[PDB]
């Protein structure tokens, strides 16, 4: 049975001058730049650590180029704390995405930086 | 963030 | 009782190079740059014209600086064809936003450009 | 670029003999009868001020004559605090509607009076 | 263990003069006035027969006096074709309600008459 | 107007060794085995009494043989506290089901025993 | 940064005797028994292949012992075609689960066998 | 419509 | 639990 | 409440 | 796009 | 199905 690799990133969110700041840490707890290289088919799991007091929850993963084939699917937990990407690593190249989150302070969606 | 695919 | 202005933009989305292109038109059908200036409390209404076969629907309006006070609220229609912003114009300044859309081809959210 | 008028009403809800009472105030904070005249295309925004302790939230705007063409669309905020109506003011006439709200005390929907 | 009565009504909806008409039929297909009398704890089940092309679906049951205790709870099927009321018959009296429906023609909710 | 019978069961949930235990009580408050015999068309109403501190809510009723015709429909209250089954008692036989519940401790669904 | 394994199973569902049959295949299209062994932190991805005309969609993954710690989280795609489990492999032992699916024929949820 | 409770 | 139908 | 349309 | 508030 | 954890 073929298998792949499961990668993990923690999405830590704080505020600075009242606005979100996203800091990524790896499975060792170390700050990392947040980008992931996929060298064979697998998954990437992002865990939200909301330290903003704004009640953030994932509602999806957004792409300016959603049809580029780099990521195949997005799955989301019912509590908004996890998103997972399915990446079959057939299409070479790079895609950029922004996390999409609801918040409990207002009805605007929150985006991580472009 | 970004994801970079390097296919096999 | 005081009234404000209700501004309107049609959000035309079509594919080029396999990916979305957002083209804004005004109430006269004329292409416009897309940004809106608010000089008193009012609303801005955005109507989706999905020209693609990708089944686009608005799911919200996203902000990298969602707590800046420029836009107070977002409302959305049940069919995903309209979003409206409430701008009481009490905080001066500029904010940038990206439309957030679902699609029926895949489970990735679609963003307009940053 | 054509523009319209944005009107505003606050929907204040209290209880009397255990049941909801809807009192409308205008953009000056003054009690008003709650009805709106639309003299050109535009929007009407209703802001919920729930003073009932029953956890009211808008879930939509209901019409006995929903196909009469007077209101074109309803948009709703994700927190249930705002509904906005789009009224292109092409069809002359009058329509009557009732706000539809969920509550946290029971699973019945709440309607404002006919 | 005590049992109650399970009553049934078919909610037939058709257009006349461009707007809905609600016609109630009983389990024998006979037109009835539509009101239900409860003399012991039980249920009332309402089945939607949408005769229109407007894609009607129940979204709930609305009450101008939702805290009167006459009806204890509302349940709804995932397909919007059934609503059921739970009436423990512990509070004597009468309540009036209006069905609340979504439609696929527009984003206005549909109400049966007050 | 034809009528049927409305049966009632309370679904009491506790924990034992950290895991759910379902105990059914009847309309007299007496412990019962939980199974229901349907001798004519009617309804069965299940009321959740969550004593787990895990924030249980019904999200539906699950069947390994969902097309067997024994139960016609499932309706659910908006607060997850009630499910009702519609059973027209035309198809003879027995079906087994498991309640499906969300919880607030994790994103796994909870099932009552097979 | 440490990585885990991403395992995969295709969940093929077809009717026999009027009821679902769940047949699992691996990444090579080979029928397999369906159980998965986890020896380090990772993910398991389940792809729905609905071979029926019943409009099946995943709505979650259900557990009679949801607090056993074997599986940490469930994520689901917006189209109901994928569920993924997060298994940090920190609690040794075995858990049993049943897929939970909606269908378009009726309002009963579908379960895979206990 | 209406519901009439006679307890 | 179970439901047992005995039709009329 | 009500809405009254007076078209232009 | 952008929104520009001039109060 | 089942999941078997061998830590
Ligand atoms: Ca800071
Ligand atoms: Ca189109
Ligand atoms: Ca009072
Ligand atoms: Ca029909
Ligand atoms: Ca115990
Ligand atoms: Ca198929």
CA distance G79 to chain C (A): 7
In whole angstroms, give the CA distance from residue F43 to residue F74.
10
Give, as one character, the DSSP assignment of residue A24: E
Dmax over CA atoms of chain F, in Å, equals: 50
What SS3 string covers chain I?
Answer: CEEEECCC
Q: What resolution (Å)?
A: 1.2
Q: What pairing do the DSSP bridges indicate for beta strands I2-5 and F36-38?
A: parallel
Alpha-carbon distances of A97 from C113, D53, D71, G63, rounded to whole Å: 11, 41, 38, 33
- Which residue, among G70, G59, G76, has the nearest Cα to G96 in the 3D structure? G70
Distance F54 CA to ligand 5 centre (A): 13
Place of tokens 């037109």: E31
Alpha-carbon distance F56 to nearest alpha carbon in chain A (angstroms): 14
User: Is G53 an 8 Å CB contact of chain F?
Assistant: no
DSSP label at residue G67: T
Q: A24-33: long-range contacts at Cβ-Cβ below 8 A with a sequence spacing of 24 or more?
A: A24/B1, A26/G1, A27/G1, A27/G2, A27/G3, A27/G41, A28/G1, A28/G2, A30/G1, A32/G1, A33/B1
- Nearest by CB to residue F87, choosing from I1, I3, I8, is I3
Residues of J in contact with D37 (CB under 8 A): 3-4, 6
Q: Any bridge partners for residue G8, and if so which?
A: G45
Q: How far is CA A81 from CA A57, A78, F89, G62, in A?
A: 6, 8, 44, 19
Q: Decide: E72 and D108 in contact? Cβ < 8 Å.
A: no
Task: Find out whether G66 and F19 touch, Cβ atoms under 8 Å.
Answer: yes
Distance CA F103, CA F13 (A): 12
Separation between Cα atoms, residue F33 and residue C49, nearest integer Å: 57
Separation of E32 CA from ligand 4 center, angstroms?
Answer: 20
The domains found in chain G, sorted by start residue, are 1-114 (2.60.40.420)
Q: How far apart are CA K3 and CA A85, in angstroms?
A: 32
Which two structure tokens, joined as six digits, stand for D45? 């925004």
> Is residue A76 less than 8 Å (CB to CB) from chain F?
no
Nearest alpha-carbon partner for B5 in A41, A38, A33, A71: A38
Residue linked to tokens 């009553």: E7
Q: Which residue has the tokens 């049927």?
A: F4
Sign (positive or negative) of CA dihedral E50, E53, E57, E58: negative
* C-alpha F49, offset from chain centre: 11
Using CA atoms, how far apart are residues K2 and L3, in angstroms rounded to an integer? 49
Per the CB < 8 A criterion, the answer to whether G27 and G12 are in contact is no
Q: Read off the tokens for F23.
A: 């105990």
Identify the CA nearest to A87 among candidates A33, A40, A51.
Answer: A40
- Which of G7, G8, G114, G106 has its CA nearest to residue G52? G106
Of the candidates F4, F8, F75, which has its C-beta nearest E76's C-beta?
A: F75
Interface partners of chain D (CB pairs < 8 Å, 3 or more) are A, C, E, F, J
DSSP state of G41: S
The radius of gyration of chain I from alpha carbons, rounded to an integer in Å, stands at: 7
Chain F residues with CB-CB distance to D102 below 8 A: 78
Task: Supply F66's token pair.
Answer: 């969902």
**Can you give D17-60 as a three-state secondary structure string?**
CCEEEEEEECCCCCEECCCEEECCCEEEEEEEEECCCCCCEEEE
Find, in chain C, the residue whose alpha carbon is nearest to that of E106: C79
Under DSSP, the state recorded for G13 is: E
The minimal CB distance from B3 to the residues A24, A95, A112 is found for A95
Q: Residue G69 phi/psi, 5° resolution?
A: 80, 0
The whole-angstrom separation of Cα C13 and Cα C29 is 14
The DSSP bridge pattern shows strands B2-5 and A36-38 to be: parallel
Look up tokens 């109901």; give the residue: G80
- For residues E40 and E37, give the distance between their C-alpha atoms in angstroms, rounded to a whole number: 9
Shortest distance, CA L6 to any CA of chain G (angstroms): 5
Give the span between the Cα atoms of D83 and D101, in whole angstroms. Answer: 11
Q: Which residues of L touch G111 (CB under 8 A)?
A: none
Please give, one letter per residue, the 3-state secondary structure of A58-80.
EEEEEECCCCCCCCCEEEEECCC
Residue of E38, E97, E112 lying closest to H5 (CB–CB) = E38
The distance from CA D39 to its chain's CA centroid, rounded to whole angstroms, is: 18
Distance CA D89, CA C27 (A): 14
Distance between CA atoms of residues D72 and D91, nearest Å: 10
The neighbour count for residue E35, using CB atoms within 10 Å, is: 13
Looking up tokens 């043989």 gives F65
d(CA C21, CA A64): 9
* Residue owning tokens 């036989």: F93
D chain contacts of residue C30, beta-carbon cutoff 8 Å: 1
Ramachandran angles phi, psi of D14, nearest 5°? -125, 180
Give the Cα separation of F69 and G106 in Å (integer). Answer: 10
The per-residue DSSP string of F11-79 comes to EEEEEETTEEEEEEE-TTS-EE---EEESSSEEEEEEEEE-SSS--EEEEEEESSTTSSS--EEEEETT
Structure token digits, residue D10: 């606050």
- The contacts of residue E53 (CB under 8 Å, 6+ apart) are none
Encoded tokens for F98 = 């498991």
Cα of G58 from ligand 6 centre, angstroms: 14
Chain G residues inside the 8 Å CB shell of A41: 6
Radius of gyration of chain A (CA): 14
Chains touching chain H through at least 3 C-beta pairs below 8 angstroms are E
Interacting residues of A65 by C-beta distance below 8 A, sequence separation 6+: A95, A96, C19
Please answer whether residues A41 and A86 qualify as being in contact, where contact means their C-beta atoms are separated by less than 8 angstroms: no
Q: Does E82 touch chain G if contact means CB atoms closer than 8 Å? A: yes
Three-point CA angle G27, G29, G35, nearest 5°: 65
Residue of K nearest to C114 (CA): K1
Q: Among F15, F3, F1, which Cα is nearest to F103's?
A: F15
Spatial CA neighbour of H4 closest among F20, F112, G38, E42: E42
In angstroms, the separation between the Cα of residue A17 and the nearest Cα of chain G is 31
What are the structure tokens assigned to E78, written together? 């995932």
The Cα–Cα gap between F45 and F82 comes to 7
Residues 1-40 in D contacting E (C-alpha not used; CB under 8 Å): 15, 18-20
Given a contact cutoff of 8 angstroms between Cβ atoms, the answer to whether C58 and D22 are in contact is: no
Give the integer Cα–Cα distance in Å for A21 and C93: 20
- What is the rounded CA–CA span in Å between residue E31 and residue E46? 14
Is E43 in contact with F6 (CB distance < 8 Å)? Answer: yes
Q: Do chains G and E touch (3 or more CB pairs under 8 A)?
A: yes
């Amino acid at each position: 049975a073929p298998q792949g690799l499961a990668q993990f990133i923690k999405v830590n969110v704080t505020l600075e001058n009242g606005e979100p700041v996203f800091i990524y840490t790896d499975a060792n707890g170390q700050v990392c730049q947040g980008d992931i290289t996929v060298t064979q088919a697998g998954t990437i799991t992002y865990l939200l650590n909301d330290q903003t007091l704004k009640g953030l929850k994932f509602v999806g993963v957004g792409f300016v180029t959603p049809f580029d084939g780099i990521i195949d699917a997005v799955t989301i937990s019912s509590d908004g704390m996890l998103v997972q990407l399915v990446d079959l690593d057939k299409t070479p190249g790079t895609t950029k995405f922004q996390f999409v989150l609801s918040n409990t302070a207002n009805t605007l969606l929150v985006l991580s930086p472009d | 963030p970004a994801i970079i695919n390097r296919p096999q």
